[PDB]
Amino acid sequence: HHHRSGNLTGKTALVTGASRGIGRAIAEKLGYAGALVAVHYATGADAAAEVAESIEKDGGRAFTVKAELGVPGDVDVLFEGLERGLKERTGATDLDILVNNAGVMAMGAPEEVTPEMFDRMMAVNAKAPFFIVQRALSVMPDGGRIINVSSGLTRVASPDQVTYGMSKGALEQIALHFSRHLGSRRITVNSVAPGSTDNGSALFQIPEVRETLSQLSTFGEVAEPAAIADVVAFLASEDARWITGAFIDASGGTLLG
Amino acid sequence: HHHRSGNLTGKTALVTGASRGIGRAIAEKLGYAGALVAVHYATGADAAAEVAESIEKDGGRAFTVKAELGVPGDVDVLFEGLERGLKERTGATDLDILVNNAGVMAMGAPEEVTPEMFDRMMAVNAKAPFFIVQRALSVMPDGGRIINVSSGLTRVASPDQVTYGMSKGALEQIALHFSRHLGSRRITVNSVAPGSTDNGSALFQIPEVRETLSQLSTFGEVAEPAAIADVVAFLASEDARWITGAFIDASGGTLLG
Amino acid sequence: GNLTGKTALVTGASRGIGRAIAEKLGYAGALVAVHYATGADAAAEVAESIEKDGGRAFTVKAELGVPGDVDVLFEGLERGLKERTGATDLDILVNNAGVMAMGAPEEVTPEMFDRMMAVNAKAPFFIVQRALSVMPDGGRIINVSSGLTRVASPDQVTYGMSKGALEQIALHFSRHLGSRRITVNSVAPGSTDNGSALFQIPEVRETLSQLSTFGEVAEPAAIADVVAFLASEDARWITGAFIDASGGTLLG
Amino acid sequence: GNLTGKTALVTGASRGIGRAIAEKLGYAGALVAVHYATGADAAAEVAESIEKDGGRAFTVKAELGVPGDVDVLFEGLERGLKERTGATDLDILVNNAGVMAMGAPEEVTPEMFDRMMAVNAKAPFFIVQRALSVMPDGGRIINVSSGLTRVASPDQVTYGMSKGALEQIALHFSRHLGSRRITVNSVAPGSTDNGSALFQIPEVRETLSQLSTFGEVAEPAAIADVVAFLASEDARWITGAFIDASGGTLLG
Ligand SMILES: NC(=O)c1ccc[n+]([C@@H]2O[C@H](COP(=O)([O-])OP(=O)(O)OC[C@H]3O[C@@H](n4cnc5c(N)ncnc54)[C@H](OP(=O)(O)O)[C@@H]3O)[C@@H](O)[C@H]2O)c1
Ligand SMILES: NC(=O)c1ccc[n+]([C@@H]2O[C@H](COP(=O)([O-])OP(=O)(O)OC[C@H]3O[C@@H](n4cnc5c(N)ncnc54)[C@H](OP(=O)(O)O)[C@@H]3O)[C@@H](O)[C@H]2O)c1
Ligand SMILES: NC(=O)c1ccc[n+]([C@@H]2O[C@H](COP(=O)([O-])OP(=O)(O)OC[C@H]3O[C@@H](n4cnc5c(N)ncnc54)[C@H](OP(=O)(O)O)[C@@H]3O)[C@@H](O)[C@H]2O)c1
Ligand SMILES: NC(=O)c1ccc[n+]([C@@H]2O[C@H](COP(=O)([O-])OP(=O)(O)OC[C@H]3O[C@@H](n4cnc5c(N)ncnc54)[C@H](OP(=O)(O)O)[C@@H]3O)[C@@H](O)[C@H]2O)c1
């Protein structure tokens, strides 16, 4: 197996929800840069394997980690798999880069939202990222990186996605408070807000929604996942060392009013 | 019983957590303005009665409603009591003004936050306000008002209150998304962000915290609850008809950097 | 009313939003200085309307954006306040006067830029500066901005720049003046019918109405009611703020 | 590097942050126009440093904030680009040049105000305007603002106003230029050691260091690395943004 070197050679990274979509693109980019990437998934193990194998065929290093998030024991399951894999491959449990990308999306009348729907959105999109950050701190060296994938919908009124917006609003608070907490350790903590992005899902196959999504960006297109990944990879690098506690707009001009 | 008239005469209002602190001040001000005020509480029934009686002795109309928020059946319990009281006193269940003020606060190391602590903060401060709004829409006439009491801590990094900050970040999203949803009904939906406010609690009796809280405002004082209530009462009035989807900074210059 | 015994200057009060603000502050009991550049008869009408409804008011001419402007304004203001009250004290300052323009960004000239900045940002700064010498503790400074500082509008970029500058006044002066308990805030109206012919053209009115989540352009009274609140003791704990009075124009 | 074949103008590149930006863009492969007002020898040093490390660069003199400034700048720039590349195409524009000042708000003069606005807001607007005629699709406009647009700083209110105006350029022009895929963004450095004597005074350096959550003032390279990212294809989906490169100065 040939080894491609890059700016993140020697670093380790966890990307949650890396089996497809934006997460996949993030893992691929971090892997290309030289980071040993833990490609996390809930149930898409074949997709996750494809990503990890892609990273390795291109000269990188990667492995998959299964953990359903939003249920009791989730963070323990995640970190058992992560730390086993990191120890096997590096001799240590150190985690340099954490990308909280896994999330769920939903569209529906606000009048129809149930308490169970609210709990699930909040459990996956806000609660799990908090507890993943909390657990990561015990193994993240000084100079680390935490990047939380939010949404432009925290700045664009979208009644049919209020629950989702609430969960991402909570997510964004992680960067604000933890950036200060972790300043002395030089761990940067930032939110990245993608605009509408073609994740290859069934919902993007629907003509009615797909038509309106393209016009949200000032560029008149939805994003390719790679356009979001390139921003995350920058934040994960030395070049973004003076950026912390920030909201980074990667929406292609969706937040212009 | 003598009747004092004001700008809100004929209107009805629910103020959650109106037994003490900011909520009490809000109820008193809305009552003085002529609104029939439902003074809500969880367990401080004697304090709630004192508030309602204060409102009535000053020429207004008020009654108390018990509901523990953040538990199954909470919104049903709340609205059973509210609607019974409104029907008894007005012949209708119409609710003109909704103030989501009830909330919990906590200070502690981020490393020590437990999942149970997170759930409770989110259940009371974000989830319950969402479901209260959802339920209120079925009884709120066009021209109504929804005011959510947030916190300046959504804009000031405060590691020992990250969980609280997350919950208020979620809360703030309610005004953004619902303002658009409800535009055609002319129901305004806004967030108000108090700065540190003397609520008469035990925590304000502690010298160490009380000293640092006073210096957060550019005025070098903590707020009196009445200073926050006067802002809420404005938002509840006709004079604030062109304000919706807004974050209203009632922090006495706490958010200046 | 709640401003009885207070004095106020409302710049650009001869018409539009400023006229509505003057009328509202006067009704609440403030002695209002009704400022104008060339609209002397319209200014006189506003002052008379305030008097007619039981208040006190007078007019003060000053063309803003030219050398000597703030001197002219404050000579007229302070003389008029001293004559009427026995003091030059100014409790409430509303920087409302402003100019608006639409055009392709490629056609903006340096002269157009200077004029916009001179009236919309520079004059408000020097008016605030001069007002500090005569504003008692518990005073109020309210700057009328625009929602266009938050909504990308290429045909109004120079106006946007000027209002972005104006908004910084509240940020920095709120901290400077905290110990005097003078609040300093920006109010951002949405599209508001100022009585100009522009707003009577159906196609233009329709387009502008759709900017608000309410599907209407504002009446000036809707903005004035917000300003009067900020000028009152009810807004004593609001300083350094951006107050969105746009009818939901800033929702994305 | 990732900017090979691209051309760039960095205003105020003779020293400080602009010098670091020029050096970084040149290392990435851009032909860099190193602009200055009076620092000709320092500008020459920067251009030589770029050449020495394998790149291409040249200097262009223009005093900004005076009549004819943009004409002088673009005559020099376009002639130099045409000579070196055969075209006047400008891919990357960095409005970095700016003036800073501290003093009591009561002592600010109209002349001080005009100078600050002329250099920090007006010249960037007219530079952008002129650049549109020679910027190809896929270009980049990056305006260097300041964290002080978000941190109340009474002794720097006029600077704050000027930077608040500057920030509006990205908002409005991002929408104007979307169909050309030219991104327009503001970068906000925190306190950054620009090599001036101010930063060698221990007491001042200590105070400024505490503004960042890292307890240090920035090296110019930390800011330049952010600008170089924005100038690259990696930032193609960032437009109309405020990018906080302040080391956690804006946390409250
Ligand atoms: N697409 C957009 O337009 C858009 C816009 C803005 C922001 N975002 C945000 O970007 C992130 C990625 O979005 P996307 O469109 O790439 O998502 P997507 O294609 O659905 O992919 C979701 C990823 O998250 C994982 N995941 C979902 N639920 C999980 C759970 N409960 N536990 C563990 N993993 C779970 C999935 O794993 P499996 O494969 O195992 O199911 C998958 O890898 C999300 O946070 C989303 O909110 C997306
Ligand atoms: N104090 C500050 O400095 C400050 C600053 C910014 C924002 N805020 C926000 O302002 C709001 C009021 O704060 P405060 O200081 O006035 O509060 P406080 O004095 O503790 O009063 C809390 C009120 O909420 C009620 N409540 C608490 N938990 C409840 C629950 N689970 N179910 C139903 N009611 C519950 C309490 O009812 P009982 O009397 O029955 O217990 C009480 O009426 C909160 O949303 C808080 O987050 C406060
Ligand atoms: N209308 C809107 O949709 C809208 C929306 C958002 C914000 N705004 C802001 O609200 C404020 C008032 O706008 P408006 O629509 O009411 O404007 P308007 O109807 O055009 O009235 C302009 C007022 O300002 C005065 N003025 C203009 N230039 C002046 C100068 N150089 N020196 C002294 N006074 C000058 C005018 O005095 P004369 O009568 O003597 O000419 C007049 O009283 C402005 O700052 C504007 O930017 C307006
Ligand atoms: N340093 C900080 O802490 C800091 C923090 C935040 C933002 N900023 C911003 O970052 C940018 C660069 O700041 P810096 O600290 O690197 O500044 P600096 O060390 O003072 O360098 C100023 C540069 O701008 C040029 N310049 C100044 N006035 C000019 C004019 N009227 N016409 C043409 N060029 C002019 C100078 O050219 P000459 O050499 O010919 O005089 C010089 O190259 C500025 O926009 C500043 O506002 C700085």
Q: Where are the beta strands (DSSP E) in chain D?
A: 7-10, 31-36, 56-61, 92-95, 140-144, 183-189, 242-245
Q: Which residue has the tokens 């303005």?
A: B33
Q: Is residue C151 less than 8 Å (CB to CB) from chain A?
A: yes
Name which residue sits closest to atom 17 of ligand 2, judged by CA. Answer: B21
Structure tokens at A115: 């308490």
- B242, B247, B248, B249, best to mutate vs chain C, most C CBs in 10 Å: B242
Q: Which residues of C are catalytic?
A: 145-146, 159, 163
Ligand-binding annotation for A38, yes or no, is no
The amino acid sitting at D218 is A
> Does the CB of C183 have a partner CB in chain D at under 8 Å?
no
- Name the one residue in this structure whose structure tokens are 């006439």: B141
Best of A189, A192, A241, A242 to mutate (most D CBs within 10 Å, chain D):
A242
Distance between first and last Cα of chain C: 38
Distance in angstroms (rounded) separating the CA atoms of residues B19 and B185: 31
Question: With contact defined as beta carbons under 8 Å apart, do C175 and D152 qualify?
Answer: yes
Token pair for A172: 């964004």
Alpha-helix residue ranges (DSSP H) falling in D177-250: 202-209, 220-230
**For this structure, is A196 an active site residue?**
no
Identify which of B226, B254, B249 has the alpha carbon closest to the alpha carbon of residue B26. Answer: B226
Q: Tell whether ligand 2 has an atom less than 6 A from the beta carbon of residue B94.
A: no
Measure in Å the smallest separation between the Cα of A151 and chain B Cα atoms: 12
Q: Which residue in A has a C-alpha nearest to residue C249's C-alpha?
A: A257
> A220 at the D interface (CB within 8 A)?
yes
Q: Which residues contact D202 (CB under 8 A, 6 or more apart)?
A: none
According to DSSP, residue B91 is labeled S
Active site residue A179: no
Q: Residue B101 Cα, ligand 2 centroid: separation in angstroms?
A: 7
Cβ contacts of residue B42 below 8 Å, gap of 6+? Answer: B17, B66, B67, B68, B69, B102
Q: What is the dihedral of CA D120, D121, D126, D127, to 10 degrees?
A: 40
Query: Nearest Cα to C189, choosing from C3, C12, C14, C16?
Result: C16
CA-to-CA distance for C116 and C103, rounded, in angstroms? Answer: 13
Length of chain D: 252
| Residue nearest (by alpha carbon) to ligand 1 atom 5 | A196
Query: Is the CB of residue A189 less than 8 Å away from at least one CB of chain D?
Result: no
Active site residue A201: no
Indicate the helix (H) or strand (E) that contains A45. helix A45-57
- Neighbouring CB atoms inside 10 A of A204's CB total 15
* Residue C135 amino acid letter: M
Residues of D in contact with C153 (CB under 8 A): 172, 175
CA atoms of D248 and D186, how far apart (whole Å): 16
DSSP string covering D109-164: -HHHHHHHHIIIIIHHHHHHHHHTTTPPTT-EEEEE--GGGSS--GGGHHHHHHHH
Instruction: Say if residues B252 and C237 touch (Cβ distance below 8 Å).
Output: yes
Specify the 3-state DSSP secondary structure of B189: strand
In chain D, where the domains are located: 1-252
| Cα of D187 from ligand 1 centre, angstroms | 30
Q: Could you give the 3-state DSSP secondary structure of residue C92?
A: strand
Interior angle at CA D87, CA D85 and CA D92, nearest 5: 85
Q: Burial, B172: exposed, middle or buried (Cβ in 10 Å; 0-12, 13-18, 19+)?
A: buried
Q: Out of A179, A228, A234, whose CB is closest to D248?
A: A179
The encoded tokens of residue D106 equal 């009561």
Strand partners, D36: D61
Q: Which of C22, C23, C21, C28 shows the shortest CA–CA distance to C5?
A: C28
Nearest to A220 by CA among B158, D231, D181, C34: D181
Which H or E element spans position A163? helix A162-181
Q: What 8-state DSSP symbol labels residue B197?
A: B
Q: State the fold for domain D1-252.
A: Rossmann fold (3.40.50)
A179 CB near a chain B CB, below 8 Å? yes
Q: Are strands C7-10 and C31-36 parallel, antiparallel or unpaired?
A: parallel
Count CB neighbours of D133 within 10 A.
11
Residue D99 CA to ligand 4 center (angstroms) comes to 6
d(CA A123, CA A128): 6
For domain A1-257, say whether CATH 3.30.200.20 is its number. Answer: no
Name the residue with the closest Cα to ligand 2, atom 25.
B17
Cα(D107)–Cα(D105) distance, integer angstroms: 5
Q: How would you label A50-67 residue by residue, b for 16+ Cβ within 10 Å and e otherwise?
A: bbbebbbeeebbbbbbeb
CB atoms within 10 A of CB C151: 20
- State phi, psi for B187 to the nearest 5 degrees: -95, 120
Distance spanning both ends of chain B, measured CA to CA: 50
The token pair at B38 is 């439902």
Method of determination used here:
X-ray
Q: Is C39 marked within a binding site?
A: yes
The reply, when asked if residue C17 is annotated as ligand binding, is yes
Whose CA is closest to D171, among A214, A157, C149?
Answer: C149
Quote the ligand 2 centre to B102 CA distance (angstroms). Answer: 4
As to burial, measured by CB atoms within 10 angstroms (0-12 exposed, 13-18 middle, 19+ buried), residue A49 is middle
Which residues on A lie below 8 Å from B106 (Cβ)? none
Partner C contacted by B239 (CB < 8 A): yes
Backbone φ and ψ of D187, nearest 5°? -110, 135
Q: Which residues contact A28 (CB under 8 A, 6 or more apart)?
A: A51, A54, A55, A229
Helical packing angle, A21-32 and A45-57, nearest 10°: 20
**Residue A74 and residue A42 in contact, taking contact as beta carbons nearer than 8 Å:** no
Burial of residue D246, with CB atoms counted within 10 A of its CB: 0-12 exposed, 13-18 middle, 19 or more buried: buried
The reply to whether B16 sits in an annotated binding site is no
Task: Calculate how far, in angstroms, residue C141's C-alpha sits from the geometric centre of ligand 3.
Answer: 17
- What span, in angstroms and rounded, lies between the C-alpha atoms of B191 and C244? 12
| Strand pairing report for C183-189 and C31-36 | unpaired
Deposited resolution, Å: 1.7
- Tokens in use for A39? 């490609």
B179 in active site: no
Q: A173–B179: do the CB atoms touch at under 8 Å? A: no
Task: Looking at the complex, report in whole angstroms how far the Cα of residue C144 sits from the nearest Cα belonging to chain D.
Answer: 15
**Pair type for strands C7-10 and B247-250:** unpaired
Is D115:D47 a contact under the CB 8 Å cutoff? no
